[PDB]
Amino acid sequence: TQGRSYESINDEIAEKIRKVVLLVNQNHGRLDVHDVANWVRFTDKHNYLIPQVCELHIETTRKDAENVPEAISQLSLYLDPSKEVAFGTPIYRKVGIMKVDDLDVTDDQIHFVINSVGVVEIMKTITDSKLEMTRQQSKFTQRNPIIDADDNVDEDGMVV
Amino acid sequence: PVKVCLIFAGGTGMNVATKLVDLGEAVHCFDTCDKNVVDVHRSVNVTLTKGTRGNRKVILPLVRPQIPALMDTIPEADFYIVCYSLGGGSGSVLGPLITGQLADRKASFVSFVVGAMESTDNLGNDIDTMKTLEAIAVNKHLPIVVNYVPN
Numbered sequence: 001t002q003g004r005s006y007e008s009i010n011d012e013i014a015e016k017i018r019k020v021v022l023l024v025n026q027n028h029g030r031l032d033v034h035d036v037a038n039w040v041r042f043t044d045k046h047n048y049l050i051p052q053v054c055e056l057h058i059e060t061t062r063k064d065a066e067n068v069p070e071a072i073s074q075l076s077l078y079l080d081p082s083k084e085v086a087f088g089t090p091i092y093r094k095v096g097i098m099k100v101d102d103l104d105v106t107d108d109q110i111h112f113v114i115n116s117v118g119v120v121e122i123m124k125t126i127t128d129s130k131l132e133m134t135r136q137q138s139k140f141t142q143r144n145p146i147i148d149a150d151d152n153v154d155e156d157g158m159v160v
Numbered sequence: 161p162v163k164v165c166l167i168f169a170g171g172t173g174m175n176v177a178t179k180l181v182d183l184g185e186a187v188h189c190f191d192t193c194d195k196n197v198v199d200v201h202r203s204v205n206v207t208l209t210k211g212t213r214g215n216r217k218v219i220l221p222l223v224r225p226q227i228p229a230l231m232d233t234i235p236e237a238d239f240y241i242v243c244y245s246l247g248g249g250s251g252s253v254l255g256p257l258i259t260g261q262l263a264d265r266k267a268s269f270v271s272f273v274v275g276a277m278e279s280t281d282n283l284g285n286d287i288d289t290m291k292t293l294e295a296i297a298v299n300k301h302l303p304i305v306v307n308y309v310p311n
C-alpha cells in the first residue's frame with residue numbers, strides 16, 4: 001500500500017508466517033496433521049467445490065474472523081477452551097486447543113479462514129490503480145522529428 | 161467377564177473418557193492418532209491404530225484390517241458402553257466397527273453418540289454414521305441402542 005515501508009510489510013508477513021508455523025506445530029489438543037491437510041486441501045473431500053486461488057485470512061478475534069465473506073474452510077485455535085464458539089458458515093470447520101506452556105503461543109485465539117470471493121476486488125484495485133497512473137503518463141504527445149528527408153543520413157545514421 | 165467395559169473412539173470419545181478415568185481398567189480408548197491423548201489417560205487403556213497419522217471413506221480401509229487386533233484388547237464383559245462422535249472421521253468408523261464386533265459376541269450394550277453440527281462435512285458424517293448403525297442393526301438382527309446428543 002502506498003506510503004508503507006517494505007520493512008513494515010515484511011514484518012507483518014513474518015509475524016503471520018509465525019502464526020502458521022504455530023498452527024502446524026502438531027502440539028495442539030484435538031488437532032491432527034490430517035485436520036490441517038483437509039482444511040487447506042478442502043476439495044479432496046468436498047468434490048463439489050471448485051479448486052482455484054483462495055485467500056487465507058489470519059485473525060485474532062471472533063469478530064474479524066466472522067467478517068470474512070463467504071468463508072469456505074476455517075481452523076480456530078483457542079488457549080482458553082471456554083471461549084470456543086462455533087461461529088460463521090464455513091463448509092469445513094476445525095478447532096485446536098493451544099497449550100499455555102507452549103512458548104510460541106502469542107495470542108489467546110487465532111482463526112485461519114479460507115475464502116475465495118475476495119481475490120476479485122484485490123485484482124480490480126490493482127488494475128484500476130495502474131490504469132489511472134498509466135492514463136496520466138500515457139496521455140503523451142512527442143514532437144516532430146528534428147531531421148528532414150533533406151539530410152544526408154548514412155547506414156549508421158551518421159550525418160556528415 | 162467383567163461387569164462392564166467402556167469403549168471410547170475418536171477425539172470426542174477421548175475427551176469424554178478424561179471425565180471417567182476413575183473407572184480405570186474398565187475404560188478402553190481407541191483413535192487413529194494422539195491429538196487427543198492427555199496425561200490423565202495413563203489411568204486407562206489407550207490404543208492407537210497403525211499407519212493412520214475427518215474423511216471416513218479414507219479412514220475405513222486403513223483401520224478395518226486392524227479391528228480384530230483391537231478386539232483382542234477388549235475383555236469379555238456382561239455389558240458394554242460405546243461412545244464417539246457421529247461427525248468426525250475416526251470415532252465414527254472405529255465406533256461402529258467395534259459395535260459390529262460386539263454384536264457378533266451376542267453382547268448387551270448401549271452407545272452414546274454425538275451429533276456434530278459445525279459444517280456440512282460433520283452433518284454428512286452424522287447421516288452416514290446413523291445409516292451405518294441402522295445397517296448394522298439389520299445385518300446383525302439386533303437393536304442398536306443409542307443415547308443421541310446433538311451439539
Ligand SMILES: Nc1nc2c(ncn2[C@@H]2O[C@H](COP(=O)(O)OP(=O)(O)O)[C@@H](O)[C@H]2O)c(=O)[nH]1
Pocket residue numbers: 030093094169170171172173175176214244245247248249250251252274276277278282311
Ligand atoms: N460434544 C463434543 N463434540 C465434539 C468434541 N470434539 C469435537 N466435537 C465435534 O465432533 C466432530 C468430530 O470430532 P472428533 O470426535 O474429534 O473427530 P474424530 O477424532 O475424527 O472421531 C467435530 O467436528 C466437532 O463438531 C467434544 O469434545 N465434545
Ligand SMILES: [Mg+2]
Pocket residue numbers: 030032170171195248250
Ligand atoms: Mg481425531
